Scaffold this motif. Structure first.
Motif, mmCIF file in Angstrom:
data_model
loop_
_atom_site.group_PDB
_atom_site.id
_atom_site.type_symbol
_atom_site.label_atom_id
_atom_site.label_comp_id
_atom_site.label_asym_id
_atom_site.label_seq_id
_atom_site.Cartn_x
_atom_site.Cartn_y
_atom_site.Cartn_z
ATOM 1 N N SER A 254 0.807 -1.205 0.000
ATOM 2 C CA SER A 254 0.000 0.000 0.000
ATOM 3 C C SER A 254 0.851 1.271 0.000
ATOM 4 N N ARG A 255 1.933 1.305 0.738
ATOM 5 C CA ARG A 255 2.749 2.512 0.853
ATOM 6 C C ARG A 255 3.505 2.740 -0.436
ATOM 7 N N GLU A 256 4.135 1.698 -0.987
ATOM 8 C CA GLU A 256 4.845 1.815 -2.260
ATOM 9 C C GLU A 256 3.916 2.362 -3.341
ATOM 10 N N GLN A 257 2.674 1.851 -3.401
ATOM 11 C CA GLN A 257 1.721 2.270 -4.415
ATOM 12 C C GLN A 257 1.274 3.706 -4.233
ATOM 13 N N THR A 258 0.801 3.964 -2.991
ATOM 14 C CA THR A 258 0.087 5.230 -2.805
ATOM 15 C C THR A 258 1.026 6.376 -2.508
#
Ligand SMILES: O=C(O)C1=C[C@H](O)[C@H](O)[C@H](O[C@H]2[C@H](O)[C@H](O)[C@H](O[C@H]3[C@H](O)[C@H](O)[C@@H](O)O[C@@H]3C(=O)O)O[C@@H]2C(=O)O)O1
Ligand SMILES: [Ca+2]
Length: 490
Positions: A254-258
Motif C-alpha cells: 500500500s505505501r509503495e503504491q500510494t
C-alpha cells in the motif's frame, strides 16, 4: 566440523512454515544456509508457496496426514497450545532444561516471556518470536500537502476530518485530478483501529482483536457499544472516500503504491519503515514529506496510541510428536538464542548484508540506502522471520532515520501508548472453552466489522442480531472464563 554443530552426522528435517500470507521457509535463503552450515542441521520446507492465507495452510497441514518435524509461523500461539495439549506438539520444558542453555538462561531472565508461552497444563509447546523495542506504530501525515493547502496539523478528530476532506478534494498533488486517497494502510485491521478516534478500542495489544482490561474487567473491543457507535463513524469516512476504498484488499505494498504515486495522505504504521519513504521517494517526488503526528484528541478527550511492541508475540515454532530428533531440534532452536545465532537471525549473513566492525554488526551501505525497507530486505534472505528468535533493536536503529527517531521520541515522551493487555492464566477447563469458541468468534467479528465499514451491513440495524450471534457462538462463555482467570489471578 564446527564447534557449533549440534550433531556429528548431518541431519535434515522438514518444516512447515507459511507466514504473513506471503512467504514460506526457503532452504536456499542465505540465513538458512548459514545456520545449516554452523549447526549441521538443514531444514527443508514443505508448505505451499502459492497460498495466500497462512492460517488456512496450518489447518490444511493438520488435515493432510502425517505432520512434518517442525511447524512455524505468525499467529500460531493458540494453535500450538491447543494442539500441544492434545499431543501433536511435544512439551519442550525438559528438553530445554537438559539441552538448551541459551534458552534456559533467557527464560530465567525473562520470566514474563516464559509465562506468556506456557499452557494451562504447565507445558511449553513453542518458542516465540521475541521482539525488541518499545513503540511500534504511530500516525503519519503528508506535511507537504498540509503546506500546499495552508492547513495546520490537525489536533482533533474534527480538524482531521476537514484536512482529509481537503486532501481528497483540493488536488494537493497538483495534477488536476481527484486521485488522492487521504488515509491508506498496509493492514486492513488498522481501519478498525480508526474507532479510537471516537473513544472505542479495537484491540488490547499488538495481537489483532485482543481483549483489554478496564477497571478490573475483561472486555473485547468488538462486543462493546462504543464499537457500534465508532464503526458507524468509520463507515461514514469510508463512504465519503477519506479511507482507501481498497483498504481490505490492497495490503502489503500500500505505501509503495500510494505514496510512490503521490496519492496517499496519511497512515498509521511502524515508525522506521514508514519514515524511510521520505528517503526512498526523494528523487521522484522532491517535496515529499511524510511526518509523524501526535494522535488527534478523540471524542473522549484523549490522544490514544493503541499499539505497542508485544514481547513476546504469538508467533514462533514447535516440535511435532513425529519429529524423531527432538534433542537435535531443541539444540538447533537454542542456537538462535546464542550470540551468533541472534546476529544471523536479525542481520542476515556476514560479508553479505553486514560486516563486523569494531566487534559490532554494521549493515552495508547498499542495504541502508536501498529503496526497500531493511526489514523487507531481511525477510527476503530469511532474517526477521517469525521463527523462535530474539530480535535485536540494534538492527533497527541502523535504519531508523531522524524523522522516525523524532516521532518515536515524541510518542515515548508524551506517553500516548495505552497500557497493553498482558493476558490471563486459564485453567485447563477454562482453556477448553476458549479453544472451542474463540477462534470462530474472532473470524465472525472480523467479517461483521468489514461489512460495517463497507456499508453492506448497517451497524445500528444489525447490532442486535450480532449480539445474539455472539452469545450463540460462545462469546460470552469465553468472556466469563477470561474474567474468572483474571480474578483468580488478580
Ligand atoms: O516496519 C518497521 O519499521 C518495523 C520494525 C520492526 O523491526 C519489525 O520489523 C516490524 O515488523 C512488522 C511489520 O512492519 C508488519 O507490521 C508485520 O505484520 C505482520 C504481522 O505481524 C503478522 O505476522 C501477519 O499478520 O502478517 C503481517 C505482515 O507482515 O503481512 O509485523 C511485523 C512484526 O515484526 O511484528 O516493522
Ligand atoms: Ca490530484
Amino acid at each position: 566440523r564446527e564447534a557449533t554443530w549440534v550433531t556429528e552426522k548431518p541431519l535434515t528435517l522438514k518444516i512447515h512454515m507459511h507466514f504473513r500470507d506471503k512467504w514460506v521457509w526457503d532452504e536456499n535463503w542465505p540465513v538458512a544456509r548459514e545456520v545449516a552450515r554452523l549447526t549441521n542441521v538443514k531444514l527443508v520446507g514443505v508448505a505451499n508457496r502459492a497460498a495466500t492465507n497462512s492460517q488456512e495452510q496450518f489447518n490444511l497441514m493438520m488435515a493432510s496426514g502425517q505432520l512434518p518435524d517442525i511447524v512455524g509461523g505468525d499467529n500460531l500461539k493458540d494453535k500450538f497450545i491447543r494442539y500441544g495439549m492434545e499431543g501433536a506438539f511435544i512439551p519442550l520444558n525438559k528438553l530445554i532444561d537438559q539441552n538448551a542453555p541459551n534458552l534456559k538462561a533467557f527464560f530465567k531472565t525473562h520470566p514474563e516471556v516464559q509465562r506468556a508461552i506456557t499452557a494451562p497444563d504447565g507445558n511449553i509447546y513453542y518458542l516465540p518470536y521475541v521482539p525488541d523495542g518499545l513503540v511500534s506504530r504511530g500516525y503519519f501525515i503528508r506535511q507537504d500537502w498540509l503546506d500546499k493547502l495552508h492547513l495546520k496539523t490537525p489536533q482533533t478528530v474534527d480538524e482531521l476530518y476537514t484536512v482529509l476532506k481537503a486532501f481528497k478534494e483540493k488536488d494537493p498533488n497538483g495534477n488536476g485530478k481527484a486521485d488522492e486517497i487521504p488515509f491508506i494502510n498496509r493492514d486492513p485491521e488498522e481501519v478498525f483501529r480508526l474507532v479510537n478516534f471516537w473513544g472505542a478500542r479495537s484491540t488490547g495489544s499488538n495481537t489483532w482483536m485482543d481483549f483489554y482490561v478496564e477497571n478490573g474487567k475483561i472486555k473485547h473491543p468488538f462486543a462493546e457499544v462504543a464499537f457500534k457507535d465508532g464503526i458507524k463513524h468509520v463507515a461514514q469516512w469510508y463512504k465519503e472516500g477519506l479511507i482507501d476504498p481498497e483498504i481490505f484488499t490492497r495490503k502489503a505494498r500500500s505505501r509503495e503504491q500510494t505514496f510512490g504515486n503521490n496519492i496517499g495522505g496519511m497512515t498509521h504504521d511502524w515508525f522506521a519503515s514508514t519514515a524511510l519513504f521520505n528517503d526512498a521517494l526523494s528523487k521522484n517526488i522532491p517535496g515529499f514529506k511524510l511526518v509523524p503526528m501526535a494522535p488527534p484528541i478523540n471524542s473522549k478527550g484523549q490522544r490514544w496510541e493503541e499499539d505497542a511492541r508485544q514481547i513476546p508475540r504469538p508467533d514462533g515454532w514447535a516440535i511435532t510428536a513425529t519429529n524423531k530428533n527432538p534433542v537435535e531440534t531443541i539444540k538447533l532452536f537454542d542456537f538462535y538464542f546464542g550470540p551468533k545465532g541472534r546476529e544471523l537471525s536479525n542481520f542476515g549473513v556476514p560479508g553479505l548484508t553486514y560486516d563486523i566492525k569494531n566487534g559490532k554488526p554494521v549493515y552495508k551501505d547498499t542495504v541502508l540506502k536501498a529503496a526497500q525497507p531493511v526489514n523487507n530486505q531481511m525477510y527476503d534472505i530469511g532474517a526477521q522471520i517469525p521463527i523462535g528468535f530474539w530480535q535485536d533493536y540494534e538492527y533497527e536503529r541502523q535504519w531508523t532515520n531522524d524523522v522516525a527517531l523524532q516521532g518515536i521520541d515524541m510518542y515515548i515522551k508524551n506517553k500516548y501508548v495505552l497500557p497493553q493487555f498482558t493476558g490471563v492464566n486459564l485453567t485447563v477447563e477454562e482453556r477448553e472453552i476458549y479453544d472451542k469458541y474463540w477462534p470462530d468468534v474472532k473470524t465472525y467479528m472480523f467479517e461483521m466489522g468489514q461489512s460495517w465499514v463497507m456499508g453492506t451491513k448497517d451497524p445500528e440495524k444489525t447490532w442486535n442480531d450480532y449480539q445474539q450471534q455472539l452469545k450463540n457462538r460462545g462469546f460470552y462463555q469465553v468472556m466469563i472464563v477470561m474474567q474468572k482467570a483474571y480474578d483468580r489471578q488478580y
